[PDB]
Coordinates of C-alpha atoms in Angstrom, one line a residue:
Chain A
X1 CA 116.2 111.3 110.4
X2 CA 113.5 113.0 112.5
X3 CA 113.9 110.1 114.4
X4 CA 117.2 111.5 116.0
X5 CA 116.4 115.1 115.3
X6 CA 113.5 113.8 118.1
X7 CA 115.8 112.6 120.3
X8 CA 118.9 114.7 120.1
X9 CA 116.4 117.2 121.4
X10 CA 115.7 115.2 124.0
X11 CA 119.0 114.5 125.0
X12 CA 119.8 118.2 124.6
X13 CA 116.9 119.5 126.7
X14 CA 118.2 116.7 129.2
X15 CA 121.8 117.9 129.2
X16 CA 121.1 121.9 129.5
X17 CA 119.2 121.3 132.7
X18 CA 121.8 119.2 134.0
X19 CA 125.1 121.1 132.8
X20 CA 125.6 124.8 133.2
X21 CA 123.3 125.5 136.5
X22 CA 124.4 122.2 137.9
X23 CA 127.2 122.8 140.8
X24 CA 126.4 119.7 143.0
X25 CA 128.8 117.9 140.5
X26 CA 128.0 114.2 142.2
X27 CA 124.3 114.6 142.1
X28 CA 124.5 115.8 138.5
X29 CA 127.0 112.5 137.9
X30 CA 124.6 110.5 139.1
X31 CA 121.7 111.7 137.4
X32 CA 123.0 111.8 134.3
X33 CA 124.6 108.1 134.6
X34 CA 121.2 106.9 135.0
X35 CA 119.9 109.2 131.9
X36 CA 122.7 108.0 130.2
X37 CA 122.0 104.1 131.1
X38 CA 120.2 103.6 128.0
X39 CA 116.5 102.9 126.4
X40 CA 115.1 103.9 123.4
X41 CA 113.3 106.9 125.2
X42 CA 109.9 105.3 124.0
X43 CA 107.9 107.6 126.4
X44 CA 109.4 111.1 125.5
X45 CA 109.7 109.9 121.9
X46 CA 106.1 109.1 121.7
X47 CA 104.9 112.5 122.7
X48 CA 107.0 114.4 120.2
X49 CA 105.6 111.4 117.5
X50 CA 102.1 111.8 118.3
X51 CA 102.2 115.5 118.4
X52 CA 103.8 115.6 114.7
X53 CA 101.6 113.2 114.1
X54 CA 99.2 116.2 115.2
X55 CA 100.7 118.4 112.8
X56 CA 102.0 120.0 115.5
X57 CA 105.5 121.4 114.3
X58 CA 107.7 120.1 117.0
X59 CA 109.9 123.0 118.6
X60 CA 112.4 122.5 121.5
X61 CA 109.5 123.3 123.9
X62 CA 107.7 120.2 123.4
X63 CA 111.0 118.3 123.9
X64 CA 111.2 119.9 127.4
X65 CA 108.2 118.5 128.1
X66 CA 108.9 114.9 127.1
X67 CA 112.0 115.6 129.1
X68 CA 110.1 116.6 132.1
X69 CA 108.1 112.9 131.5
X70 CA 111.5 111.0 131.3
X71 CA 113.0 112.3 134.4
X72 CA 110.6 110.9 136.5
X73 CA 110.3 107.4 134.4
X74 CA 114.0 107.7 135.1
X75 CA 113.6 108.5 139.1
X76 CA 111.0 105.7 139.3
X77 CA 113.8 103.3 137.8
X78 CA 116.7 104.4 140.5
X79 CA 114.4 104.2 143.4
X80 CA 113.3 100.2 142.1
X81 CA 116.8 99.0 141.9
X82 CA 117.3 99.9 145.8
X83 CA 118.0 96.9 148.1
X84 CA 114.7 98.0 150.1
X85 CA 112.9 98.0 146.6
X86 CA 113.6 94.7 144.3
X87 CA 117.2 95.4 145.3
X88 CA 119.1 95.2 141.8
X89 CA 122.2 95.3 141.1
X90 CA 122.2 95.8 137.5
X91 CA 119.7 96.7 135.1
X92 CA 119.7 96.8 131.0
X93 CA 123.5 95.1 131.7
X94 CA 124.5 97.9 133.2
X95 CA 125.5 98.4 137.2
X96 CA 122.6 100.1 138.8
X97 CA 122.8 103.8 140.2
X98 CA 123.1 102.8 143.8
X99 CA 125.7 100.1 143.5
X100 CA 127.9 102.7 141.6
X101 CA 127.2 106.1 143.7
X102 CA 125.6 104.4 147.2
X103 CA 122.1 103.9 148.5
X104 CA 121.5 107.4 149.7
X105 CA 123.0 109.3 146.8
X106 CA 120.6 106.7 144.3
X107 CA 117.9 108.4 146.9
X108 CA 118.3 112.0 146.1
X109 CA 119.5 111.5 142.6
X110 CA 115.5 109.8 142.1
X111 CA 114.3 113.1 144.4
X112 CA 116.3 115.4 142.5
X113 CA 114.7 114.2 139.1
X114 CA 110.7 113.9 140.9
X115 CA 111.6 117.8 141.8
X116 CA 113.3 118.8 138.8
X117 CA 110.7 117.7 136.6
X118 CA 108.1 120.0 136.5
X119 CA 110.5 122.8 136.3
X120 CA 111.0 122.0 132.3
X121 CA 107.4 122.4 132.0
X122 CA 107.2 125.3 133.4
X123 CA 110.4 127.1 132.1
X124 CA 109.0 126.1 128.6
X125 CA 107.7 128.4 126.0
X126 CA 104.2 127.4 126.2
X127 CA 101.1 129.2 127.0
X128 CA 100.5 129.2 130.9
X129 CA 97.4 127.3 130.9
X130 CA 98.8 124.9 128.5
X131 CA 101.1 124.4 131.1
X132 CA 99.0 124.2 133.9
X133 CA 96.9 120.8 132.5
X134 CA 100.7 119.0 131.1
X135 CA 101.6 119.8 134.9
X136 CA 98.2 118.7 136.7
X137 CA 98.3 115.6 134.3
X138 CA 101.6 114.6 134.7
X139 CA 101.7 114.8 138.3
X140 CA 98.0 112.7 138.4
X141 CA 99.7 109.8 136.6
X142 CA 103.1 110.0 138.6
X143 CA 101.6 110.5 142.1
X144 CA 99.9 108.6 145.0
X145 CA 96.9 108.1 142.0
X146 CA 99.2 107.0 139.7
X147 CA 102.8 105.3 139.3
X148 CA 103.9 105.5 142.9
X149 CA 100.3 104.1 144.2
X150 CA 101.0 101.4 141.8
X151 CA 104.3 100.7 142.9
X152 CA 102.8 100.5 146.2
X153 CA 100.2 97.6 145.4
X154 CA 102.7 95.9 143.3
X155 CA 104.8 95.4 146.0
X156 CA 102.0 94.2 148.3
X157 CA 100.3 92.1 145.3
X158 CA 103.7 89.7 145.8
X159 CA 101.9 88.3 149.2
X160 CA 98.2 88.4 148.2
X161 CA 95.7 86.5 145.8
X162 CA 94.9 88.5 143.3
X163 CA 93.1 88.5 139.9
X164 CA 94.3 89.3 136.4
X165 CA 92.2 91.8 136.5
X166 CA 93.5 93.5 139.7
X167 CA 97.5 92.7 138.8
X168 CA 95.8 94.7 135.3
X169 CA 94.9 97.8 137.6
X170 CA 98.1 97.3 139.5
X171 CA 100.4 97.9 136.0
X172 CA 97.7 100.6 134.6
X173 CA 99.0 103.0 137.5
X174 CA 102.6 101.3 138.0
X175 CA 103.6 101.1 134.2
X176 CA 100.1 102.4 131.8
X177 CA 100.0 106.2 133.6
X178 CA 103.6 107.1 132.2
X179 CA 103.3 105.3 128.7
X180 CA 99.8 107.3 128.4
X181 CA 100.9 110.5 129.2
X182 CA 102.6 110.9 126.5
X183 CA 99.2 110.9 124.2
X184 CA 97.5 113.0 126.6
X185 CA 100.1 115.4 126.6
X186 CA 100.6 115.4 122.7
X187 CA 96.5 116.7 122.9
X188 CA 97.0 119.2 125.5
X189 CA 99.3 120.9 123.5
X190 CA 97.7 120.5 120.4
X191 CA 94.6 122.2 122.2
X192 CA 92.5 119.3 121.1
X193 CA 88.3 119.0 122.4
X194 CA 88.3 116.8 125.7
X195 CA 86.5 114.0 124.3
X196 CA 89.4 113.5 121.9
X197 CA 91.9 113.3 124.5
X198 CA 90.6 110.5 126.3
X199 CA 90.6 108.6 122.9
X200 CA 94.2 109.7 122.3
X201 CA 94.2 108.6 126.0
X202 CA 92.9 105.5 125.5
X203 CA 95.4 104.6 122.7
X204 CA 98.2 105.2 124.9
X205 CA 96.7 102.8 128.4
X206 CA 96.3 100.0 125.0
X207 CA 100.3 100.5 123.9
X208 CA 100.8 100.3 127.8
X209 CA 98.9 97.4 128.4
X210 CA 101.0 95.6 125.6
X211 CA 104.2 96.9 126.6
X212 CA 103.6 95.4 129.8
X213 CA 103.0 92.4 128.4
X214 CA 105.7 92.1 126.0
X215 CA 108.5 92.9 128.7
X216 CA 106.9 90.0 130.7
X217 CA 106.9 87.4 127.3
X218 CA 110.7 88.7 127.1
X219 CA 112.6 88.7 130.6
X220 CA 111.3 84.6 130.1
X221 CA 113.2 84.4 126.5
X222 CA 116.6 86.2 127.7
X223 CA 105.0 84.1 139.5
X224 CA 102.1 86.6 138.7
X225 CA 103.7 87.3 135.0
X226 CA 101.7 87.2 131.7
X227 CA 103.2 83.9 130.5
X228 CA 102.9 82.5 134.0
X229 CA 99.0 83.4 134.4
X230 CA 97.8 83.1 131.2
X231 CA 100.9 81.3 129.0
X232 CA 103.5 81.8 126.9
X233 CA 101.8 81.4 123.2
X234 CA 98.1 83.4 124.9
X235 CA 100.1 86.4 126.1
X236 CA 101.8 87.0 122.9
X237 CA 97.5 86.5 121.2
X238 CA 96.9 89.3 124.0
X239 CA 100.2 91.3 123.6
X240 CA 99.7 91.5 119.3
X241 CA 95.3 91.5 119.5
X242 CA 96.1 94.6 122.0
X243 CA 98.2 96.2 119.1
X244 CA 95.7 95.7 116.6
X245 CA 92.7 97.7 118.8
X246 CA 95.5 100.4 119.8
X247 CA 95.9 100.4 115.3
X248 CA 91.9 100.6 115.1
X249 CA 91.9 103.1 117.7
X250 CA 94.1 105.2 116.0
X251 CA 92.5 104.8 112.5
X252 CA 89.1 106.0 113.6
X253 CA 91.2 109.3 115.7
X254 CA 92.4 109.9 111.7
X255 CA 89.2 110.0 111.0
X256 CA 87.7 112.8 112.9
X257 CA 90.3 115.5 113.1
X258 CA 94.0 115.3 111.0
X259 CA 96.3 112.5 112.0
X260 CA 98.9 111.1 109.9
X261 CA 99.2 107.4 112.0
X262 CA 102.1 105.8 109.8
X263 CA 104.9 106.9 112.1
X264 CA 102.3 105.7 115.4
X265 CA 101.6 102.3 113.8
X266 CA 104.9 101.7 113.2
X267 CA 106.2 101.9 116.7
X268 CA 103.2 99.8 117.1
X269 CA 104.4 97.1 114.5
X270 CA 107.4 97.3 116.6
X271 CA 106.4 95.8 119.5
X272 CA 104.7 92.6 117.7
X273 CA 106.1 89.5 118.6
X274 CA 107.1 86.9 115.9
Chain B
X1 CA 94.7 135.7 169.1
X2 CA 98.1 135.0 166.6
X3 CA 98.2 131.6 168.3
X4 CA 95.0 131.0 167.7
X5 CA 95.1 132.8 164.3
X6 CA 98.4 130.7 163.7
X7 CA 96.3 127.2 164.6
X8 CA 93.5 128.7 162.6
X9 CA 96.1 129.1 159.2
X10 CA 97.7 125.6 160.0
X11 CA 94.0 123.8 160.6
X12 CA 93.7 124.9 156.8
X13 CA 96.7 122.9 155.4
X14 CA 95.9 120.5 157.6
X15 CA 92.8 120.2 156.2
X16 CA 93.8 120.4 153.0
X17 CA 96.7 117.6 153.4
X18 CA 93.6 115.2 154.4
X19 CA 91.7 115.8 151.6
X20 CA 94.3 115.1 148.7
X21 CA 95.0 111.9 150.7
X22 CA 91.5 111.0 151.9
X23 CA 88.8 109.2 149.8
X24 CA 90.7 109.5 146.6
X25 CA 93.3 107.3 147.3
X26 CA 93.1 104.1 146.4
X27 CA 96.7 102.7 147.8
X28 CA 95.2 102.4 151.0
X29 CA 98.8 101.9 152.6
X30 CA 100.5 104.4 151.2
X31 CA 97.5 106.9 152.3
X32 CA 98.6 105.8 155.8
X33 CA 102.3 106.3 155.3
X34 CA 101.8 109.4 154.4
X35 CA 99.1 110.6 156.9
X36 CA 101.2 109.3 159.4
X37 CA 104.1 111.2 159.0
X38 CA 101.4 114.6 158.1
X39 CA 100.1 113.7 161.5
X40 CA 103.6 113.8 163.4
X41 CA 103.2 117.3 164.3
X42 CA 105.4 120.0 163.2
X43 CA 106.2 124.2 163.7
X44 CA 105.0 124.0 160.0
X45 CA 106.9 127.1 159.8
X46 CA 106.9 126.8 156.2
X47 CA 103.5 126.8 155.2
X48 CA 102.9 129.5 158.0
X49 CA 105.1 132.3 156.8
X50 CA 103.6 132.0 153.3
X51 CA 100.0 132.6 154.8
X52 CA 101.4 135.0 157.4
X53 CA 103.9 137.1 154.9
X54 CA 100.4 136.7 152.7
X55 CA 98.2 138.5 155.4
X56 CA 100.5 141.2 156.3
X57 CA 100.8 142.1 152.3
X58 CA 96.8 142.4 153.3
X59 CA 95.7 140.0 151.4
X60 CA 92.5 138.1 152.3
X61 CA 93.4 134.3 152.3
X62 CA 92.1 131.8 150.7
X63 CA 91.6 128.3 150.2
X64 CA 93.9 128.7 146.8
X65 CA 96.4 130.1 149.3
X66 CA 96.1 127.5 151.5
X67 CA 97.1 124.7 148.9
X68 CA 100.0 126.8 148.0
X69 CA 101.3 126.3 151.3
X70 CA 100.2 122.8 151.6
X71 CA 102.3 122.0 148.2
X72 CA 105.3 123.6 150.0
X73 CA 104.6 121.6 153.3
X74 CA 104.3 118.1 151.1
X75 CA 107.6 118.5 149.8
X76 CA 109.8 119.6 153.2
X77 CA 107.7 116.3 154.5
X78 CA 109.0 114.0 151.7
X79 CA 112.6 115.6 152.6
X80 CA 112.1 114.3 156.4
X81 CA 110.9 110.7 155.3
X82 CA 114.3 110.3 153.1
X83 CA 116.2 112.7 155.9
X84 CA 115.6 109.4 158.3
X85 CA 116.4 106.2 156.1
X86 CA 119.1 104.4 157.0
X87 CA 121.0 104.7 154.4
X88 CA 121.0 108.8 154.9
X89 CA 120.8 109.9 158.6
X90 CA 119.3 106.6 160.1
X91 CA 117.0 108.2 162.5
X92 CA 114.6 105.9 164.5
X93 CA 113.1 108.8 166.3
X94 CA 112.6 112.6 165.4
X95 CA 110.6 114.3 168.2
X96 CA 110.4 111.3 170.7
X97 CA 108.1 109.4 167.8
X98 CA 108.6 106.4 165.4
X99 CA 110.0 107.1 162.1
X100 CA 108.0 106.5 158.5
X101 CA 110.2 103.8 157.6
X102 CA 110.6 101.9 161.3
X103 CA 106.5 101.8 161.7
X104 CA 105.8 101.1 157.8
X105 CA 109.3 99.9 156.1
X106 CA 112.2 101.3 154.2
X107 CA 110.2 101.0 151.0
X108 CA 107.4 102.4 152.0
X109 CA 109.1 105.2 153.4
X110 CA 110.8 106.0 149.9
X111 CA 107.9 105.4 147.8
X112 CA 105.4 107.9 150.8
X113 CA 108.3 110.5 149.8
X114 CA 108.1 109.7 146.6
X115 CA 104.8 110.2 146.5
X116 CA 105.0 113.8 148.2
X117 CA 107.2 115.1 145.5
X118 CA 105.1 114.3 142.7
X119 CA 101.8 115.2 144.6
X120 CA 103.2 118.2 146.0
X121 CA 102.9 120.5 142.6
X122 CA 99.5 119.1 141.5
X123 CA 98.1 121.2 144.7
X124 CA 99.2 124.8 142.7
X125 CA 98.0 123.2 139.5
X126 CA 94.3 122.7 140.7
X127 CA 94.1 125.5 143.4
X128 CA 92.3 128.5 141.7
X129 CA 94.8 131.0 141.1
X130 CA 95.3 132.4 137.4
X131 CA 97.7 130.3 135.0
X132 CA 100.5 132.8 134.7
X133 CA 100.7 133.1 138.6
X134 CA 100.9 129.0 138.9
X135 CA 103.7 128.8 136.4
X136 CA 105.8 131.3 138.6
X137 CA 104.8 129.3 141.7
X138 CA 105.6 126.2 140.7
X139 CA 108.5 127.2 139.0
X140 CA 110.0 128.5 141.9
X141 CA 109.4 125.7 144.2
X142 CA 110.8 123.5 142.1
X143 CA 114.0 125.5 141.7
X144 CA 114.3 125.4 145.7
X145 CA 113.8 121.8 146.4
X146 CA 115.9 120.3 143.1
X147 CA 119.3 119.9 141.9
X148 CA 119.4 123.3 142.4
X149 CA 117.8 123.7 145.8
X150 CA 117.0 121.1 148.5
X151 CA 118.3 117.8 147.4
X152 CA 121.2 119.6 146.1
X153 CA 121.8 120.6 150.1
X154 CA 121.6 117.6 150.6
X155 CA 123.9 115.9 148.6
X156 CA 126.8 118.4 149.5
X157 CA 125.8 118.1 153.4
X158 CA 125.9 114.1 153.2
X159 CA 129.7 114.8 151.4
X160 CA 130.6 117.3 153.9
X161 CA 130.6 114.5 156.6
X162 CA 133.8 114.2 158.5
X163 CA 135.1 116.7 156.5
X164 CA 136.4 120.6 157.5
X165 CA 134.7 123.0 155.8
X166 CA 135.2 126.6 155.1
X167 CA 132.7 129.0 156.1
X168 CA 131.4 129.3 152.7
X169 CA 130.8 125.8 151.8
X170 CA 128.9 125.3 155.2
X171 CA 126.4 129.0 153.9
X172 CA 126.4 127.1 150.2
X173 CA 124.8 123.4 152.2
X174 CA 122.9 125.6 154.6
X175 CA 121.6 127.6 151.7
X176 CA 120.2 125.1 149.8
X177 CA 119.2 122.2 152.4
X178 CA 117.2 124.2 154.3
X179 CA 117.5 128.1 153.3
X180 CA 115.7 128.2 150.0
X181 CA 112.5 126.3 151.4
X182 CA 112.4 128.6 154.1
X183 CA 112.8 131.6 151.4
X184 CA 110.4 130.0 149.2
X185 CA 107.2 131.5 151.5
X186 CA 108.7 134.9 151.5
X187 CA 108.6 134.9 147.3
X188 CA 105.2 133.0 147.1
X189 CA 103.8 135.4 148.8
X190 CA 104.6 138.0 146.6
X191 CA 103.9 136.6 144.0
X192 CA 100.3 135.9 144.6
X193 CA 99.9 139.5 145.9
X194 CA 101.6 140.5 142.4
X195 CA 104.4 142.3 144.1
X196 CA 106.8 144.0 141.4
X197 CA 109.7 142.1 140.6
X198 CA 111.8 144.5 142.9
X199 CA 110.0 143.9 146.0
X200 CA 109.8 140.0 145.1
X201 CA 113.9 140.1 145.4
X202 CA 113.1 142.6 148.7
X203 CA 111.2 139.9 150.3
X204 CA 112.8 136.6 148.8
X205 CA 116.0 138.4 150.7
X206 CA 114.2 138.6 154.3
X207 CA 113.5 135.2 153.8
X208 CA 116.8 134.4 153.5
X209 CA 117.9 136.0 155.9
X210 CA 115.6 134.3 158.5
X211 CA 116.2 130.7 156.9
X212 CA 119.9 131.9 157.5
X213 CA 119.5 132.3 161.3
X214 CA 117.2 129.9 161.8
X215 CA 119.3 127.1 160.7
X216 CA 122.4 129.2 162.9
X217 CA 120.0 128.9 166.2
X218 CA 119.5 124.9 165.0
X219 CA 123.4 124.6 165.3
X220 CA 123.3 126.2 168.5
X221 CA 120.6 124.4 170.1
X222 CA 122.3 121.1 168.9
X223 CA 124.8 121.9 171.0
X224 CA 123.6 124.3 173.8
X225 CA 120.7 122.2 174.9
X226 CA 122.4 119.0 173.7
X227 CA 129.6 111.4 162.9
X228 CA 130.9 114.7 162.3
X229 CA 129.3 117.0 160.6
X230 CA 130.5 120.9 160.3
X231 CA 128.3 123.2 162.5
X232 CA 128.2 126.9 162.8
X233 CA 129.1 126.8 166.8
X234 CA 132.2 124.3 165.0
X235 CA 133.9 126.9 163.3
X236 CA 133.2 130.5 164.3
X237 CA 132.6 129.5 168.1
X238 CA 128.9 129.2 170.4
X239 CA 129.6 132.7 171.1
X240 CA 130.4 134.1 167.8
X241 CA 127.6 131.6 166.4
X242 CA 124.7 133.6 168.6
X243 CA 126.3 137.5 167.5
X244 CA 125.8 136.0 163.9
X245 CA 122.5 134.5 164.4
X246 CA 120.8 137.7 166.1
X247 CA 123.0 139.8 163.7
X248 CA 121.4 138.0 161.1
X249 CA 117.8 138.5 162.5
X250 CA 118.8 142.3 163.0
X251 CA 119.3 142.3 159.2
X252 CA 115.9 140.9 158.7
X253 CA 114.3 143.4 160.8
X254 CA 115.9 146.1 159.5
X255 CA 115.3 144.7 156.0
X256 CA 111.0 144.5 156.7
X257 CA 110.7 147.4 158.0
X258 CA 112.7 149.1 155.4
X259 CA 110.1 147.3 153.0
X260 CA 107.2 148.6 154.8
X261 CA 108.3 152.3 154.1
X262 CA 107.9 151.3 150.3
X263 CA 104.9 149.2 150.3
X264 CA 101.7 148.2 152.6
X265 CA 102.9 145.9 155.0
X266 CA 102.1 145.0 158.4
X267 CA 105.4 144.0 159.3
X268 CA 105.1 143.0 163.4
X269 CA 103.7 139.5 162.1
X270 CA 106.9 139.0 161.0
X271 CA 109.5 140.8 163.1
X272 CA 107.5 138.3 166.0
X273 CA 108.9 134.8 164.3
X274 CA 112.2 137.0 163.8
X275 CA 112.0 137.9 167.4
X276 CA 111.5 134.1 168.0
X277 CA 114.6 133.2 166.8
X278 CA 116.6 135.3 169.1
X279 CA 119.2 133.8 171.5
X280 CA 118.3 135.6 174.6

């Protein structure tokens, strides 16, 4: 239903900017292998979900600007897999970007995405200021005070004693900024008052959180990890009690401005564990 | 003094550069990745002609103008960290000094680049310019570094590697590598003076044109003052290579002051870093 009406135009929206205008035809190969290597699109799909949760009708616009949020979760994913990174050579099941195309053309395919980005923002039909803040924010939780800072200190965590609480500000920036955005973004464009977009906010960095920790209870069932720290049977208490405050969260947004939370909570319910 | 005035324009990105990685940053290595290659120097010849196209349009700069330039500089810096890796050109040195990735590691290399690109825009987002004019700025920058631009020059010079070329596939990796960056000043400019969209194509064109030649005199100097990559000095000749680079420049000239008879412009800024460019 809506459901792939969402993500066709996500797929669409990624497919226009890499087709037509495209006439480097290995960078545009590359990119779109790793586009094409799978995922539920949980971060793009959440921004077009909370906005019609909103009642914001969704129009291709706001699917340019979940795209613009995917393409650099994507670039973020190519530049990992590199042998100077955690040097994989397949990822999902499938063969990563550099073992199919080469280490320097994974490089520029991550660039080209990082660069690319903003330009579906900006080419969208939005108002300008509108714009402006999905840009300024986007970039904020990307940058060097955001995903790439956290990939820095996640890399250097591996060979320093650190807290639960530090390896929690680590994955905030490395993993949370990206699966927030798309909350933050949702309230930008629904024009909503400041102090409601930090609680939208909010329940993003909590489905973040838990995301984190579900992906670490799950790479065990198929050193500094969740089930390694606290345990197996506690992370899942912490992984499901963090999905019950993001539910209360939500509930008490639905009750200061319209917001119909069914289709929210269930992506919610979706990443429960047993 | 222009070179004072010129250290005066670059003291401001400079400054600016600092400030976006100063106290605010957190990942206290990757601050010093990316101050370290900031602090390697540079013509900064990109930032530069946006502040120096800006003040010969007459328009009083700014620190908004300033970051502009600075988010332009950010990305053609994350270009050079990648540029060096070993698995692209595997440069230890570029002007006599350590490379990002042989004084901090490959990763951090990729990840201080990494961090350039997605920086780089947030500086036109914040700087205080109106909405509309931000949009077109960042618009445009993005279209000249991406798959359209930059890394797209990139990719097709990498592939041109012991390979023969025609002419036009050597303009069409030229172009994009390093022409549309070096453009890119020439249509900021214009666009935060509110230039009409004519005279935006007028001076978007001089900027080609100098990016053109500028990247010719690189191919000469390669090889004057000295794998197998095409060069311009390759396949026309070093001769034919310095007609076509000062023929270029001509163009340019020619091309400014011809803009200067339409609109108010101070155009001997400009016809100086066009006259740097000449081969004797």
């Amino acid at each position: 239903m809506k459901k792939q009406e969402k993500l066709a135009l996500v797929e669409s929206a990624l497919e226009d900017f890499y087709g037509d205008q495209q006439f480097a035809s290995s960078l545009r190969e590359s990119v779109l292998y790793s586009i094409h290597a799978g995922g539920k699109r949980i971060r793009p799909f959440l921004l077009l979900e909370v906005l019609e949760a909103l009642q914001v009708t969704i129009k291709p616009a706001h699917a340019q600007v979940a795209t613009a949020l995917e393409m650099i979760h994507t670039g973020s994913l190519i530049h990992d897999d590199l042998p100077a990174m955690d040097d994989d050579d397949y990822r999902r099941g499938r063969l990563t970007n550099h073992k199919k195309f080469g280490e320097a053309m994974a490089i520029l395919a991550g660039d080209a995405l990082f660069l690319d980005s903003y330009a579906l923002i900006a080419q969208a039909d939005l108002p300008s200021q509108i714009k402006v803040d999905l840009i300024a924010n986007l970039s904020l939780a990307s940058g060097s005070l955001g995903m790439v800072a956290g990939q820095v200190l996640d890399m250097e965590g591996e060979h320093q004693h650190l807290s639960l609480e530090e390896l929690q500000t680590i994955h905030a920036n490395k993993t949370g900024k990206l699966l927030a955005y798309p909350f933050q973004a949702a309230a930008i464009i629904a024009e909503l008052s400041p102090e409601m977009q930090v609680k939208l906010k909010t329940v993003g960095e909590l489905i973040g959180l838990a995301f984190q920790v579900r992906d670490d209870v799950l790479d065990v069932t198929a050193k500094s990890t969740y089930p390694a720290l606290l345990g197996l049977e506690e992370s899942i208490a912490f992984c499901n009690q963090t999905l019950d405050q993001a539910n209360e969260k939500l509930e008490e947004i639905a009750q200061q401005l319209p917001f119909e939370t069914e289709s929210i909570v269930s992506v919610v319910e979706s990443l429960r564990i047993n």
